[PDB]
Design an enzyme around this catalytic site. Structure first.
Site: not given
Ligand SMILES: O=C(CCNc1ccccc1)Nc1scc(-c2ccccc2)c1C(=O)NCc1ccccc1
Length: 330
Positions: A35, A199
């Site tokens: 990540d 971008s």
């Molecule tokens: O995109 C995700 C999670 C993607 N992982 C996943 C795993 C299993 C099934 C489906 C998906 N979540 C999102 S949407 C938008 C954000 C965000 C990031 C930074 C700042 C503001 C919002 C995050 C997120 O929190 N990503 C990190 C994350 C979350 C959960 C699991 C792994 C990584």
């Protein structure tokens, strides 16, 4: 030194990607979500609340002869999407694709939120953002990349995510056979702890390129592409029957409707995301309404170049004295 590991989609929608990681002695191999939008390496473990474990592979520090507890140290993280986890901290030996770091902070989860429990394919996260975001207290801990950097042939790692296919994370070198044309590098701000860049604009399908600055982050841990409402509206306006559904929480479209490509600018260069990368399938099993892969960042507060965007490119995370990001077509 260098390292090279294969990263694999967890499901048929490319919702996330997992990469095998060796922890401890003898090695315990867990599949972690790399990540670039966070900076903690945390794992499901023998310490994780039992009811919150459902099929994940766990790290057992008591069986690692190289594990050392940081007495009193804690960690606690809340991700942008509401999910969370927390626990205590060990140092241990961690290897990725042949590259080894001793004394790496391995954060053992005592608690994880429901979304982590419900996903049996992800055994933890390996953060690759800047170490200023690391949540370990009292003393902030370095990311795997930060710890390995000095030993690497070059202070860089690359993300080459596949569309419905395996890809590669490389540390310490740039594989010049992995992309077409040249790599265009662009300035990074580390002020928020992210690989944050600007971008130069966008196009929808064969439409004219709109020159406009879009500040956002390169985030391998986020599935979708989150952009300003104006830009997202312009995209979905080119899709027949597309609507923003309040009940689903974003844009959806009739599953058989043609999706145009989406182009984003990196300096004078262009990365083209094919239309089908933007299709995330039926909103529920059997539905002819499909979820969109480009969504508004208005609720999030930050623009995110997630997997939908990054997998259309070969991406260089350049950790030189002044970090930069590189993008190439592939
Ligand atoms: O995109 C995700 C999670 C993607 N992982 C996943 C795993 C299993 C099934 C489906 C998906 N979540 C999102 S949407 C938008 C954000 C965000 C990031 C930074 C700042 C503001 C919002 C995050 C997120 O929190 N990503 C990190 C994350 C979350 C959960 C699991 C792994 C990584």
């Amino acid at each position: 030194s260098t390292g090279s590991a294969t990263t694999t989609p967890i499901d048929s929608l490319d919702d996330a990607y997992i990469t095998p990681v060796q922890i401890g002695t003898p090695a315990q191999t867990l599949n972690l979500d790399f990540d670039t939008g966070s900076s903690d390496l945390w794992v499901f473990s023998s310490e994780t609340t039992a009811s919150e474990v459902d099929g994940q592979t766990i790290y057992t520090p008591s069986k690692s002869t190289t594990a050392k507890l940081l007495s009193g140290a804690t960690w606690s993280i809340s991700y942008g999407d509401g999910s969370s986890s927390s626990g205590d901290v060990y140092t241990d030996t961690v290897s990725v694709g042949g590259l080894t770091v001793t004394g790496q902070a391995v954060e053992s989860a005592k608690k994880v939120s429901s979304s982590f429990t419900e996903d049996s394919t992800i055994d933890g996260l390996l953060g690759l953002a800047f170490s200023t975001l690391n949540t370990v207290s009292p003393t902030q801990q370095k990311t795997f990349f930060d710890n390995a950097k000095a030993s690497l042939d070059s202070p860089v790692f690359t993300a080459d995510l596949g569309y419905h296919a395996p890809g590669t994370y490389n540390f310490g070198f740039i594989d010049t056979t992995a992309y077409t044309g040249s790599i265009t590098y662009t300035a990074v701000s580390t002020k928020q702890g992210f690989w944050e860049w600007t971008s130069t604009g966008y196009a929808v399908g064969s439409g004219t390129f709109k020159s406009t600055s879009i500040d956002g982050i390169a985030d391998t841990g986020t599935t979708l592409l989150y952009l300003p409402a104006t830009v997202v509206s312009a995209y979905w306006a080119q899709v027949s029957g597309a609507k923003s559904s309040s009940s689903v929480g974003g844009y959806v479209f009739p599953c058989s409707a043609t999706l145009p490509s989406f182009t984003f600018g990196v300096g004078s260069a262009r990365i083209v995301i094919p239309g089908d990368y933007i299709d995330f399938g039926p909103i529920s099993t059997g539905s002819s309404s499909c979820f969109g892969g480009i969504q508004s960042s208005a609720g999030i507060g930050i623009n995110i170049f997630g997997d939908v965007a990054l997998k259309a490119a070969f991406v260089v995370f350049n950790g030189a004295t002044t970090p930069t990001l590189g993008f190439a077509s592939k």
